[model samples]
Target: MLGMYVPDRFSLKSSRVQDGMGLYTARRVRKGEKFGPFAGEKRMPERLMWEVRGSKGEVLYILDATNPRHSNWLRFVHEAPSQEQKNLAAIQEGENIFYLAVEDIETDTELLIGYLDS
Candidate 1:
């Protein structure tokens, strides 16, 4: 129960990229669909999680991907195409950081959740 079981509804392939292996989607996802709540453990070290003021009055600790309490696959979601992309976005919607689909992602798309370069 570490990483997400690659859903049977779709397929994926990791291609070699500049920073590391890249995650590619093999199926099409509808617009406004969500991806994951992303598994993680209690209290990720400070180096990974950071706080941001949420629009809803509370502050949120977002993940920089080193959460060892869950599948490390999340760390694979990286930053190569400008730290910002429309494929994915993290918000204060769920426990840990939840990834949301901002646009209708097509097959072979690489999921990205922005980045923090500190």
Candidate 2:
């Protein structure tokens, strides 16, 4: 189940990848729009983990969203199945990670982030 605090322009639905939920836009989402400092229990490397890196690229922290009770809407966000479907980019700040829209996303489109950079 999706936790509390979904943004106004987004919706939750069947994931395109898994049997769980996915975040979708109810309206067009423009490029460069930022999404979150994904909320969760602060933990080490683990499931549903978002890694935080240091200036030299060492691991600083990992936000674990494996437990829905400890997470927010961002926990439902998933990795893009293919490059062409990727629209969000991950950004790290201080001790947290956030997502930025890398391309204009259409209404009803599921938001996906890619693990690779091109």
Candidate 3:
């Protein structure tokens, strides 16, 4: 079983998706600390990888939206990458999801688990 470091005020709740749970961040978070693990017992899918192709078709691993697990330390936000914000999206059944680190957090912050689309 994976262990997650949750604050005293926060709790883990059941997700609408099957075999998933949401890590509600109840208080402020500091850097360089462990939070939670990916929700399910499955590894990240190899096919659902993110690729950023350049004008010459140069590809690199940007981010994987397929891995549907969240960590306690990581938070999800609704804004996109260009919004100068950090957020995580909801997990869906049979969808790929991945965990992201919380660059910074504040008190009463509702941490998210996935990436958001513009």
Candidate 4:
């Protein structure tokens, strides 16, 4: 079966955010650790879709990860309701995005990042 790449230190489980599945830490995670360059199918920009931009402010395309078959475990990460609740930072790499842990994460903690422009 097809699957998304998830590290051994994390697991998928019901989310406390009440959204559905969430990515959780299975072991202690330190700051500076990174998770992904999110994998998903490409599409046009819609209302709340993830986007890729050019250096000069051009919209490259939209990244649609709503379909599990075309997405990675990173898609399960929810937005941090508040800054204090956030542990990860979203870093854009070329046309993709990655999640870097900005704070030390405790075991069983759900990963959360603030949306940049979405």
The TM-score obtained by model 1 is 0.61
lDDT at position 113, candidate 2: 82
Least lDDT summed over 10 consecutive residues: which range in candidate 1? Answer: 41-50
TM-score of each model, in listed order? 0.61, 0.85, 0.33, 0.83
The better candidate by TM-score, 3 or 4, is 4
The best candidate by lDDT is 2
Instruction: List where candidate 1 sits over 4 angstroms from the true fold.
Output: 1-4, 9-17, 44-69, 94-96, 115-118
lDDT of candidate 4 over 1-100, digit per residue (tens): 8456788899988887756788899999998888778877899765124788888879998878878888777887888887778888888777677888
lDDT of 2 by residue, 9-96 (tens): 9999788877888999999989888887888777766437788788899987778888888888887788888888889877886667
Supply the global lDDT for candidate 1: 0.56
Candidate that beats the other on TM-score, 1 or 3, i.e. the better one: 1
Flag regions of model 2 displaced more than 4 Å. Answer: 1-3, 45-47
lDDT of 1 by residue, 1-118 (tens): 4555556434445643444456667678776776565655444325235344456756554344354545445555554466446466666553445556776878887766664332
Better of 1 and 2 by TM-score: 2
The TM-score, computed over Cα atoms with residue i paired to residue i, of candidate 2 is 0.85
lDDT of each: 0.56, 0.82, 0.42, 0.80
Give the distance in Å from residue 55's predicted Cα in candidate 1 to where it truly belongs: 8.4
Structure candidate 4, residue pairs in collision? none
Model 3 CA RMSD to the hidden true structure, in angstroms:
9.2
**Candidate 4, overall lDDT?**
0.80
